[PDB]
Structure formats: structure tokens, C-alpha cells
Enzyme design. Sequence first.
Site, short mmCIF file in Angstrom:
data_model
loop_
_atom_site.label_atom_id
_atom_site.label_comp_id
_atom_site.label_asym_id
_atom_site.label_seq_id
_atom_site.Cartn_x
_atom_site.Cartn_y
_atom_site.Cartn_z
N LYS A 1 0.87 -1.16 0.00
CA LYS A 1 0.00 0.00 0.00
C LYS A 1 0.93 1.22 0.00
O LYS A 1 2.05 1.11 0.46
CB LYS A 1 -0.91 0.00 1.23
CG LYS A 1 -1.87 -1.18 1.32
CD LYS A 1 -2.73 -1.43 0.09
CE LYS A 1 -3.77 -2.50 0.36
NZ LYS A 1 -4.80 -2.68 -0.69
N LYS B 1 2.17 -9.31 -3.09
CA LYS B 1 1.37 -9.27 -4.31
C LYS B 1 1.24 -7.85 -4.75
O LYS B 1 1.19 -6.94 -3.92
CB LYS B 1 -0.03 -9.88 -4.17
CG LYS B 1 -0.94 -9.18 -3.16
CD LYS B 1 -2.26 -9.91 -2.96
CE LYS B 1 -3.20 -9.70 -4.13
NZ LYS B 1 -3.58 -8.33 -4.36
N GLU C 1 -4.37 -5.17 -7.13
CA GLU C 1 -5.09 -5.52 -8.41
C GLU C 1 -4.91 -4.58 -9.64
O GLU C 1 -4.73 -5.09 -10.74
CB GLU C 1 -6.58 -5.87 -8.20
CG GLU C 1 -7.56 -4.77 -7.79
CD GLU C 1 -7.56 -4.42 -6.31
OE1 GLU C 1 -7.05 -5.21 -5.49
OE2 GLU C 1 -8.08 -3.35 -5.96
N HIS D 1 -8.67 -15.82 -4.30
CA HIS D 1 -9.19 -15.12 -3.13
C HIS D 1 -10.52 -15.75 -2.76
O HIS D 1 -11.39 -15.87 -3.60
CB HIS D 1 -9.40 -13.65 -3.41
CG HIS D 1 -8.13 -12.86 -3.51
ND1 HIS D 1 -7.78 -11.91 -2.58
CD2 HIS D 1 -7.13 -12.89 -4.41
CE1 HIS D 1 -6.62 -11.38 -2.91
NE2 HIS D 1 -6.21 -11.96 -4.02
MG LIG Z 1 -6.47 -4.97 -2.96
#
Ligand SMILES: [Mg+2]
Lengths: 457, 453, 160
Positions: A167, A192, A195, A322
Site C-alpha cells: 500500500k 502481491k 489488483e 481469493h
Molecule cells: Mg487490494
Amino acid sequence: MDQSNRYANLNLKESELIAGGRHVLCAYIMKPKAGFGNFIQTAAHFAAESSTGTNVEVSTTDDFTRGVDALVYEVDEANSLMKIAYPIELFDRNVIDGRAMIASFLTLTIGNNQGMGDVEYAKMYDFYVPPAYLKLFDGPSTTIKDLWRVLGRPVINGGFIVGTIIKPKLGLRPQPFANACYDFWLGGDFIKNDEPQGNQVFAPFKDTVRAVADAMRRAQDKTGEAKLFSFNITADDHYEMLARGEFILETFADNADHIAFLVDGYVAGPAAVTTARRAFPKQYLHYHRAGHGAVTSPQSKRGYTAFVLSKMARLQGASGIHTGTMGFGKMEGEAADRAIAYMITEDAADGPYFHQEWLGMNPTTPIISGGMNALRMPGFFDNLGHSNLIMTAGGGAFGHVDGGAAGAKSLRQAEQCWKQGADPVEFAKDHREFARAFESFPQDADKLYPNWRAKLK
Amino acid sequence: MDQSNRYANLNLKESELIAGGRHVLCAYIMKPKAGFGNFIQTAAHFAAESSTGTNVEVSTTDDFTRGVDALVYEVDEANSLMKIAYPIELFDRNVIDGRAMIASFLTLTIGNNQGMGDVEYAKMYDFYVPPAYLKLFDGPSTTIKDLWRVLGRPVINGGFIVGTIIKPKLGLRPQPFANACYDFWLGGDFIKNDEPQGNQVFAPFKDTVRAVADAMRRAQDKTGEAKLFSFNITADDHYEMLARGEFILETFADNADHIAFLVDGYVAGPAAVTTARRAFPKQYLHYHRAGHGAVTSPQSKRGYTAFVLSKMARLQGASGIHTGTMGFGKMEGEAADRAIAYMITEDAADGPYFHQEWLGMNPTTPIISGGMNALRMPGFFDNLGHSNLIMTAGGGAFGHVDGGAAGAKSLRQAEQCWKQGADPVEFAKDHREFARAFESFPQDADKLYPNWR
Amino acid sequence: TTIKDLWRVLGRPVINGGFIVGTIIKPKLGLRPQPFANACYDFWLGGDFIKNDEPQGNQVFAPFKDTVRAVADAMRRAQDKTGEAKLFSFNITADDHYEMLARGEFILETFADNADHIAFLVDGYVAGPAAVTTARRAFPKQYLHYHRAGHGAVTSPQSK
Ligand SMILES: [Mg+2]
Ligand SMILES: [Mg+2]
């Protein structure tokens, strides 16, 4: 017109349809619109629209057509339940290799039936795939097993993969992004891409990939432990997905087996998932389901559930998907969603309506993400029953008071605490990073561990 | 975390955001869940989840990040309205060619925001794309103009393309399928595969393609008119789509420009659409939207509307898309959906919230399908305002008493009737095939033309 | 791909699915496409698996495409008669990587719904690791049948 004589056969037995191995079975929660046919009439029309029929009789209809009709074999109007049997011959097959395609399954079983004027709503809750159709699906090629092997863990029950999302979701330039990766990797295993992260003008793809590769090398040299990264390779253009994937693997070089490929499978579609699955079968395929809530939410009475989505993803060949936090994080979810995890990981499992045998098809890993932290974890694991999974905590890691690395360690320790059946508050006394999570997220600490402050500080 | 200070700026003016040309704008109908933040707080969180943020403050957040935040610029809680401005720098671009991708637009604007625990529902009703982002989309390569040219029609206002779907939806073997195509083609222009038709074990793809090619040749020799076919090339595997497309074009040979490629764009996704668009730009790309009703239905309070879907499809490069029958057929639809058609066909048009300039991007044809027949057509055309479109009537053609060819002619005549302004009942006296449609579909004939007997 | 995948195709249990009854159509070389296919059909009435003999491919008397088509017809007929799935292991060995691809692609498209009944045989010792990897990487979903013809030149206990 009433098509119940042709497209409904309630005398068919589900057990015989399963035993025959010639039918895909689908279970829907459906409600007819007021002013049209009754429940069985509407169900028969639904079956017709989902297979061989239309709203009127056509001159072209012959004998052979009747044998491939989808059939309503069970109805329960009081509970809005409709079950339909689809002959496996309806489903499209590749010319190139004779294999099945999920696109055809979706087109027939949840396609035009979703816009019918005489149906208020219809949502698929479960489906059954017989051996003759199941064996034609790709299935996963890479599993958590391959991630465990890279990490130096046992290939059977290798345990918890401590993950995060860097983030902010978007906005970090390549080097700051890579520095945050390095920091997290001092304490954690897996990172990761968020998205939408890719080739934004402020963080070009190639610059970011190179910086992350350098960060992985540095983190591995410092810690002496292997690190993993899941890169977003999603694109509309098949060739763009290939270009991204090929660039990453060549760049990471001797660390190329440390790379997963993330695909926004719900929004980009089955075609994008298959591109990654078929072009890169030796790289862990990370199915990110962003956008799925539009249909899977319990608020929605249409489309299909998250259970159905997850089950399809395994057939498509997702290495992981997920599955949500099952009511323990920030996103919509329920404790009963544990059944989703078992459907995707086990060789045999029960859905809400159908038992499924996977015939040795590889498992898909449950990926746990969205508003998780060290404090919320023991409760999550208790509900699920195991920790053979990937969990990504963006806010739970980088929101830790002491920083990303310490955040990663609190996640590690939280699972260690759960595994040895210890009391989190007492466990925290002898584990700094985990104890510091209570201070990092006090609102959660007060709700979950009411009298923590008296014991701990 | 109340994130309204950062992700909400209600003092921003929409007109200045549009004039600046640096923001994609999205208009949503949203409702917060009970027990969380207020409307503006929930909207700000929605904007954060759809751009740069998360549910907690993170140490890595720097001041560059703030400049790319999506911003709630307008709210109307009474009408559940939320408008968000997305800086164009958020959207992913191809490494290979620097062009935009709809997958990134969808991921940001209608992705994770659809699963938020503090939102009851949120549905996109409209979006605005500025020139700087718009010009990066593929857009359509082939249009109805190219179909008109093949048919020998004028390339400007070439008119109505009479179409059908060979029913049964599935079950016909290659030769019976091809015989039905030939029959229809004696009276009509265009045939489409039904959405799931492909390479089923009872009707193999190569056998069917060859039989249809033979049927087209025979129908063209008999009638002396060009005929069109829209083949389903949808697949999960990109290479399967290429194999199907390449086989069809090689098989049809001198008739290869008579071929459209159908893609189940909603269920297979943007990736499948783009495969067809980029590999076969000279073949009309027929976007079939099967499954879209799961989100686009007015019953759904989530995802996006059919308007939004259609507008995205034009950007993706669909040559045509199903826009529904606008309340005149069997599927869900409304008369106000005429605005969908104009958004996809005009260089400038109004959505429910935003005016859009297309900057000369090619139009996408409205494809009209689902429970239409000759009787229902004049009413449909009156509502829309034009007949420069493709209409496919499966049941309306093959359900005709006299058969497919006669069915096709009744559709032809129904549009001729509308174009001339004539009374359908009186028009039918001089036009057999059209008159026989009244007898073919009496339930419809009684509702629409009460005293036809 | 493993035996598990062959068991699944045969309708056997995926764990300890047991013995796969196989044969080689003899003569090693010399049979024309239809006589070759007729012998396949005959064996398949009682057995599961047939492999090409190591040198069988695209000989002038038995062209590859004619043979593949005849065998595909024979498999279809044998499966219709017995009601049991049948397997074939085709030799796709070649010096040229692209030839191996052409052979493999032709076979899978020809067998169609029976494409998962096909193994690919590679003369891995004489053609080398490069040939094996071509088949392995281009066709990971098809059982890779390593035929070791020529190995005895080094592996024999007579060799030191
Ligand atoms: Mg996310
Ligand atoms: Mg249709």
C-alpha cells in the site's frame, strides 16, 4: 407457451443422473415474475433458454435436438429451488485439443437466462461436473506445493505463507515501491501487486519489475530465506500479457521460480486466466477476483455465488484464488464460506447441493485478503481449521507501529500462536512484534481481547 | 478511518473537471450499509478502495500518491448519487503499444468496491472519458458501413439488415443447420450462430463451417444477392479463437468479407473481445452479451447498467453489440434504452449523467435480438427513430407458418411498412408474407392489432 | 502428466488404478494405414493401450496423416463396440522442432473428443533431451512416452 412437457422431468432421480455421468447439474434459487407462468413453467422455459429452445416452436426442431435438451429434474417452490440437468454434449470443446472451456459452461448455465422477461431473478448456488466433462478441464498446473518447495518448507502441509500488499494501492514510484517490498521481506514471505498495479505512467512496468527484482535479491541475501512476488500481468491483449510475463521471468532470472502471476480473472475474464494458465503453467497463477461482488454478494439475487466462482476457478486452472476473510476482515463474507476453501483444496467435498469428486485434479489455494491483521488471525484460523494458505495483509503489515518488517513478524507470530493453541494475550507477553500489534490496532484489540491492557502493559 | 478530507472534494466543479481533460468521471447509485460511516464517509472510502487507499493509514504513503487519488466531487444522498473523478494516470497502459485497456478501467471503477463490507450496494450508471484517455482505446475497426458495402447497399444510410438465429439454439447437425441457413437466406441477409454454438460433438465446428459455406454459395447463386454469416469463435484459449477464425476465412475464400465474428464478450470477457478485435480487424466484430443480465438488470443494484456495458464495448472495438429490444421483445428492456443506441452510433451523445464526444471514433451498430417478429417491428422502429441496424429474429423467422424464407420476407416487409409510414394491417393486404405473420403469431397480432381479423 | 491421467481417462481409480494392458502393433514397420488401424481395433477389443513402434511415423508406404486418421477411426469403432476408453501413443520424434509440433497438433485436432486418449512418444535417447523437452513444454497435458531405443550402447553392463 407451456414447455414443461419437454423441458421438465421431475420423475428423474438425481442419484441416477450422477451415476450415469452424462449430465452437468446446476442448482439455482429462482423466483418467477408476477403475471407469467407458474414455477415449473418458468423453470422449464429457463431450461429451454439455457439449452436448445426459444419462446416459440420452430420448424427446424427434429428428433436429435430433444436428446440434448436441458431438463428441470427437481423443484422446491417453497424454497425457490430449481435443479437443471444439462447433457454434457451441449458444452463447447476446443477444435485444437478437444478440451473443455468454462466460457461455454457460463454461456449455457448462466447466460441468456439472466435477462429473461418472465424471471424476477435466478442465481446459481452449486453445480456438479461428472468425470467425462471434469477430465477435459485444464485444472491447476502449479499449486502451493511449488511455493512451499521454493521457500524450503515441506511439500505436504508446508504451512502458512505470510503475505502482504504494498500500500498505497497505487501511487508509489518504482524505487519507493521496491524499498517497501524489501522492508516487508525482512519479516515476511510473499508480496502481491495490488489488483490495478501494472504500467501506470508514474510507475512504469519495466522500471518497477527491475526494482522489485533488486529488492528480492537484497532481501534474500540479508535474511538467507527465499522470497516470493505475485505480479499483475492482466491485460485485454493476450500479447501484452505474454510480454509482461516473459519480461518478468527473464528479469528475475535465477529467481524466476519465486514469481507468481496475478490475473484479474473476474473483470478480464476466463480468456485472460487461460492465457496465463496455458502460456505459463510452471508459474503460480494467482486469480484475483476484483469485481466479483457485483454478482456473488448475498445482496445479489442473480448470477452466481462466490462458491460457484471458486469452483469454476479450480477447473480453469487457478493456482490460488481469493476466498475472502469469511466474516473476519473488511469485505463482505460469512463464517460458512469455509466450505469454499474445502471445495477448492480437497479431492472430495460437499457443496450446498452437490458432492464433488475431483479425480486427483490439483487443488487451488485459498488466498486470504482484505482488512486482516495479527489480532484477527487466530479467530479466522479457528473457523477454517488449517493454515496451509496464503494471507496478504496490507494494512495489517505496513500499519504496524514499528513498520512493515515488524508487521510481517506479528502475522508470522499470530499463526504460531494459533498453531500451538496458546492464549493470544499471554502469547504476546513473550513475542514483541505480536504484542505491538495490539497497540497498532487498539480498536480491534479492545473488541477481540477486552482486558489486554491490564495484562500486557 | 474517516477518509473524507483526502478522498472527497465537493468544491470541485464537474464542468472544470471535464474542461481539464485529466479525469475519468463515474456516476454511481450507492447505499451505505447500516452501522458504518455516513454517505460522504462511505463514498470517500469507496473512492479510496477504487484508487490509492485501504481501510487503515500506511507508513509508505507519500505526497505523490495524493495527486492520483480518486475524488468524490459530487453527492446527492436523497437520490443515492455519488460521482467520482479518477485521474487518468491511474489507468493501466500496454507496454507493447501504449494503448489503454478496459480491464484496468473495470478493476479500478467497478472492482474491489463491489465487495466492500460497509456498502450495501453500488452500481455505475454512466462514465465520462476525456480525449487524452479516449484516443488510447482501440475503437471499432469495422462498422455496418462495411456490411452495407458487401450487400451492395449505399455506404451512408444503407438501411435495415434482415437477420436471424438458426433455432434450435443447439441440436442441429451440420447439414440440417446449413439447409435452414439456405432457406432463410432466400429471403434474408444475415444469420448469426446462437451464443453457445461452436464445436459440439454432434455438430463439429469444421463440418458446420463447410456446410454453411456451401449453403451461402448456393443461396447467393439462386438469389443473386450477397449473404452474411456471424460465426461464434469464442473460447477460453486465445489460440482456439485464432484457429476458428482462420479456418472460417480460408474456407469461405472469396466470401471471406461476408463473415462476421461473434464473441460472447460478457462471459468470456474483454480479453476474448480484444483477441478478435486485434487479430481480425477487417472482420465485423459481433459482441454477444449473454450473461450481462446478472448485473445490468434493473432488479440488480450492483455492477453496471446496460448503457455502461454498451459504451465500454464501443471503446473495446465491438462492430456491433446487442442493445436489447427496448421493451418490445421477450427479454428485459425499456423504451428509454434508445439512448443506448445513440451513445454507440453518434459522434456526440448524452448519457444519463455525462455528455460524451467520441472524437470521430467509429460507431458500434445496435443489434436487435430476442423475441422479435414482423408484428412487433414497426413499434420498435417508431421508438428508436431509425432502421440502420441489424435485427435477428429466430422465432420470428423459423416460427413463421410458411417457413424461414417467408419469415425473412415478413421482417423485410415490416421495415418497408415502417419506412413508408403505412398502417401495418392495411399494408399486410398487399404483402402476403407479412400478412401470414399475423396468423403465425396470433397472440401478438391480437394485442398490437386488435381488429386485424 | 502421469499414469493418474491415463487411469482417469480409462475410468479407473486415480489412486492405485492398476495395470494398463498394452501392445505394439507388429510388424515394426511395413503395415499400410488401414491394415495398421485394423490390427489396432482387434487388440483394443481386449486391451487398453497401443504404442507406435519406435521408428513408425511418416514412411512413404504409411504416410503419417493417413495412419493417424485410420487409427482415430479404429479407436472410435473400438470404443463404440466395447464401451471402454482406449489409448494410443504416437511417435512424434523429429530432428526439426517444428515437425514435432506439426505432428502433435495434427494428432490432437484429428482425435478431437478423444484427444485426451493420446500419449506422445519420443525417441529420447537418439533424438536427445532437446526433442524430449519440445514435447514436454509444447504438450504438457499429453502423456510423454520416453522411448529409450539406442540406450544400450552405453547402459549395457557390457559397456564400462
Ligand atoms: Mg487490494
Ligand atoms: Mg439468442
